Amino acid sequence: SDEEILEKLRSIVSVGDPKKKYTRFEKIGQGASGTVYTAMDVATGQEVAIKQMNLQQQPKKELIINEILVMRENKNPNIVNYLDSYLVGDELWVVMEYLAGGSLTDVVTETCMDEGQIAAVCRECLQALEFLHSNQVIHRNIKSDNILLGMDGSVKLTDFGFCAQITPEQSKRSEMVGTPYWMAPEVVTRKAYGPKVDIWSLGIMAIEMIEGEPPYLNENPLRALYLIATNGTPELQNPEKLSAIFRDFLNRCLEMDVEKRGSAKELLQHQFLKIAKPLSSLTPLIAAAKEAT
Ligand SMILES: Cc1nc(Nc2n[nH]c3c2CN(C(=O)N[C@H](CN(C)C)c2ccccc2)C3(C)C)c2sccc2n1
Numbered sequence: 279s280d281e282e283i284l285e286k287l288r289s290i291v292s293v294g295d296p297k298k299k300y301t302r303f304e305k306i307g308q309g310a311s312g313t314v315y316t317a318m319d320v321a322t323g324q325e326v327a328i329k330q331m332n333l334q335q336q337p338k339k340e341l342i343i344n345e346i347l348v349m350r351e352n353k354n355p356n357i358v359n360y361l362d363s364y365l366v367g368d369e370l371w372v373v374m375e376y377l378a379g380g381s382l383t384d385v386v387t388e389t390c391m392d393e394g395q396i397a398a399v400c401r402e403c404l405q406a407l408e409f410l411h412s413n414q415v416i417h418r419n420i421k422s423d424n425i426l427l428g429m430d431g432s433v434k435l436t437d438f439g440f441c442a443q444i445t446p447e448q449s450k451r452s453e454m455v456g457t458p459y460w461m462a463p464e465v466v467t468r469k470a471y472g473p474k475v476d477i478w479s480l481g482i483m484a485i486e487m488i489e490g491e492p493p494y495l496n497e498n499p500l501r502a503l504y505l506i507a508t509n510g511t512p513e514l515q516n517p518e519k520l521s522a523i524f525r526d527f528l529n530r531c532l533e534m535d536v537e538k539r540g541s542a543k544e545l546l547q548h549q550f551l552k553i554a555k556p557l558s559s560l561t562p563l564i565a566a567a568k569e570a571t
Pocket residue numbers: 306307308309310311312313314327328329358374375376377378379380381423424426436437
């Protein structure tokens with residue numbers, strides 16, 4: 279019975295020796311959620327990022343299976359590409375594309391962004407969001423840490439461990455999942471929510487690009503969880519620094535009324551995304567974040 283859920287996971291993964299298909303292994307990161315290596319596809323000569331997790335020691339097969347499956351059926355230019363999976367010696371190896379420009383968290387916490395650079399990032403993310411939302415997938419963990427950057431300034435979404443599928447029959451969801459500071463109020467208050475929670479988290483992510491961090495970050499997770507549920511729409515520290523069209527975009531991402539809050543399809547047409555700079559204008563941000571590290 280359990281955990282015979284592994285049979286699905288062992289049926290998912292590709293077979294064969296990952297050692298044979300990839301060489302030039304170099305460690306690039308090592309968090310609590312695994313360790314990332316760079317490597318070269320012996321075939322195409324292409325560079326890949328391989329995440330290695332301890333298995334059991336995390337876990338949870340139900341949701342890590344969900345992560346693989348969801349990525350496979352949801353390929354998009356604005357989503358970090360999933361390549362392969364291999365289970366070797368109680369380790370789950372997930373081969374992903376390599377983005378060398380680091381994360382949006384490096385940028386937002388070490389640099390200042392102009393409205394043109396923020397609009398370019400918001401656009402790419404909404405493009406990924408509209409695609410997932412049309413395929414009835416809710417990310418539920420949108421934050422700057424899950425935005426990866428290409429050396430050319432490419433903006434791509436990652437981390438599908440927390441996503442959830444939806445149907446016309448079950449159009450909502452009720453689990454208190456995600457990361458506290460980015461969580462929509464309707465999620466914090468255990469109400470039935472929809473895809474628009476990702477829109478809220480995008481808005482908080484925009485606040486990151488503005489102020490360097492999401493609201494209440496000095497407070498502890500539970501304290502922040504309380505602050506969100508009571509205050510509703512978060513206040514900017516210096517709202518007047520923003521153009522009126524940026525403030526409008528923000529207010530529509532952070533609208534308490536789910537019905538009034540924008541959808542990804544809607545927000546892609548907003549006048550704030552007009553003044554978007556090309557993605558090349560992100561490379562000095564990237565360069566700046568690298569320095570001071
Ligand atoms: C680690 C690292 N990755 C880089 N680029 C990447 N290319 N491809 C990928 C990454 C990072 N990735 C990733 O899954 N990171 C997650 C954390 N994220 C999701 C919140 C992670 C990091 C460390 C340990 C476990 C899990 C993938 C998509 C494989 C880069 S660029 C400069 C430094 C750097 N350091």
